[model samples]
Target: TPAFNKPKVELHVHLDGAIKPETILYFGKKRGIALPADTVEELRNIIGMDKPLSLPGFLAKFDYYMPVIAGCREAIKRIAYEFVEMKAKEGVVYVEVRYSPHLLANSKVDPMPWNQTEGDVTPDDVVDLVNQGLQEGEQAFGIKVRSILCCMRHQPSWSLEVLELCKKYNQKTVVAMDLAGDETIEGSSLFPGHVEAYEGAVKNGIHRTVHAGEVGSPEVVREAVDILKTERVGHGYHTIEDEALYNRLLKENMHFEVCPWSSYLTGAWDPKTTHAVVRFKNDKANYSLNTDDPLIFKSTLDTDYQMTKKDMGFTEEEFKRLNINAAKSSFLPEEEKKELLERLYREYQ
Candidate 1:
């Protein structure tokens, strides 16, 4: 095989979800919180989503991990910095990191003794801290980093507030808004209202993307396009199931930020076949590869690219096309996109 190095772009990644298990354990011990498992392998076994699991069960595992993140600005900064460094090493020049700052609040204090409805820290504080960390990371690593503040669908009522927070901090750094979380918990009807909240941001000019069709049915993808008015679809792996919808996505030139390893781990398909990516490549769909959760999936941007080339049998031309698709799909301005695309073509030569 010949060397096939190429510039790449990534648009879907969770900041908190990228924290390594070792880092989690280190913070867990320092914070005096009892971790569910002491070692990385054991930790994976405890929180791994290979089997049937409910939202609450999945959240319980995070309870053990989230305590370590509460008010830990330094840790957040370190992870952000390291993540960018890793991406730069993988040949990714541009990345859009997504997360819900509101979800990272300290869960120690209870708003209701019987309910886990509240935390001590406010969402605004978390956003400020994360934005600072992201800025520091971009400066240190020399990678263009952008933020897409995510609103959890399960907490749709809080969606408007989160979008408002993103708008408050809107700048070149904070470029877009995202609606993310367990798609199974809330159906398509829940997203339009959250989309409405960001209408001004869209009008005033903020980019938009939504998490749809990851684990949900095809209707989720339809709603994301028609109702939510998303510019891109995060993990629209299942969109291939509906021919009309798939063609529509192609016609609209929407991008799918597909994570092969994470999808396999979540039982979206068998890793051996590289199912969704293979289907996408076969259909020549507009898409880009991403590591949805680096630490949790035990993968990176490089690994995703390699997997697509190896298992999905992406040719060199196909690989270059993926890079172009990513750059074109990114929220960056056209001139910036052209600059990146030119660099990619030059490097390919």
Candidate 2:
């Protein structure tokens, strides 16, 4: 029943956005947080999006569950571990999960998240805990998993520290730094702190990716490449608006982490228009399909593959090729990257 049932590679998914509904229920009860629903089915209905909603409305889904997991060491680590288990079952051979450590911690963060009282967990501790959980998950599930530290687009003050954490935990299952959050804030990417953090990343050789052209303009995508020097782009569906930039990026072989179902739900891709991914496919661009946030989208890896296959006319050969491209574009060290490529080549044949 699986679509393109092969060893897949996912490059852009958020750790905080993929937690289990059952786990959310458990955490809410344990932490005494008031969840809107007590059962998993009800919780899924509350958190999941079935129809098209704007990005802001989709993000508001987090309010119901984040408080249950944030600021709790056990909850954080458990979610990390479970995330790998879920992907392994989905036949994902490797994945790079991302999240903002500052959002998960209650202390040492300006404007503490989730309205939690000051707690002992710090952003650094959050990174260590996620590393431990991801490592444990890898061992248990026998699937390789790495993480990316995220810088909230609105919280430029935390950007530098996100870069520091990426440096501090490089190769300890932390492969890169990402800029996530709402893209509607005009000119947010040009904020000084974000610029400086990306500059430091460049100097220190840290990997970089940015959220652009999802709901923003192609100019935003241009900034991510020309200024931020991101190696990959998250949800870059809007880059096609500017024909010249699209061709240039195509020529540059820039990797776009495209989330098919997510684009529809986020209203990033109107159903009336030809999806950007169709063009990427016809042009044979370097890109990969992803489930940006499976829990919120109420999906699995197959949801994306099926969407592209059923709606966009993708084939088995295309799925194989894109997964290969995803492995190549991954932030893994060259040696491990080669190893992953070899593994995929073997299974794909």
Candidate 3:
């Protein structure tokens, strides 16, 4: 707990939900958009995830937030670029940022800059804009960045839309595919053609991860792994419920991207004190700490790590396992990951 917030690896942060509130207000003022509160502090109070929230209620924050950045292609680019700088300042050496291309590219409503006129904003334009920002991050910060194209549950439109993004994605910035939203519906079954779409993503050299187990059901986790073929799982806290399934995941060595208290607000799990991370460690499941939505939850990777230590009483030995495991499972190349582990060992020491 005494350690400075060391450089960490983050695997499940969403661009829409993770936008710093100050950045939201910045984009709003630049574009002359009217927000409920003008000051950065005022907006944070409005957007802060202070109470228990449902999945839908938590996601609704984006309705007003997304248009501000997505409206201006330049705004999107600058925010995307600055996102890397923000993470670097927080000691995130490697981060996987996921966004729904359909939400980004196909968004039509806006007071965009003169350059990106209404119809001129294409899906390619949106992705390329964010990519430019990430490109700048790589050069400026020495942090590795990869974009995961995420899809909504029961929405083939979004999944296939992202599938198309994968086909044309710039190899350097975009690395994988993800399925999020409405986890109560088993995507492989509730949504027709979802499996095939994900298969297409895999065939195109994109790795897969699913927003599974946030709903406190083992069946959903199995559906994601057995059907969708996810390489890593996002918020898979309930895998602990099924002994056989949990053991199978252990055998497969799949990484579980669990965030601290992410389920606490959503009522997905009661007992904010539930030591999911400690249980994960005991089960030998490859799980790591992350900030699921810093803005939405008013939390960060630093805060998550701190809370885990406070609630579970984890020590430096546990810190080694958390930090090093995230570095090991990062989407970076083998050479880069090996180098990151060495630096992280110094931090842990």
Give a tens-digit lDDT track for model 2, residues 1-349.
7879999999999999999999999989897999989999999999999999998899999998999999999999999999999999999999999999999999999998988999899999999999999999999999999999999999999999999999999999999999999999989999999999999999999999999999999999999999999999997889999999999999999999999999999999999999999999999999998999999999999999989988889999999999999999999999999999999999998
The candidate that achieves the highest lDDT relative to the unseen native structure: 2
Candidate 3 lDDT over 1-349, as tens digits, reads: 4343567788888877777778788888887776768877788777777878887787777766676776567778877888888788888888889887656653442323222345556766777888899989879998888888777775665567677776688366877888887776544434655677788867776778889888748888888888888888888888878989988888888899988767777766667456566788776668788877787788767787777777777666776786688778777667877888888888777
Best by TM-score: 2
Q: Write the per-residue lDDT of candidate 1 for residues 211-276, one digit (tens) a residue.
A: 877778788888878777788988888887898898888887788988877776665554454487
Give the lDDT of residue 154 in candidate 1.
Answer: 64
Q: Tell me the spans in candidate 2 whose CA falls farther than 4 Å from its real position.
A: none
Worst 10 residues of 1 by lDDT: 107-116
Q: Against the hidden true structure, what lDDT does model 1 obtain?
A: 0.73
For candidate 2, report its TM-score. 0.99
Model 1 regions lying over 4 Å from their true place: 1-4, 44-61, 107-121, 186-195, 198-201, 270-274
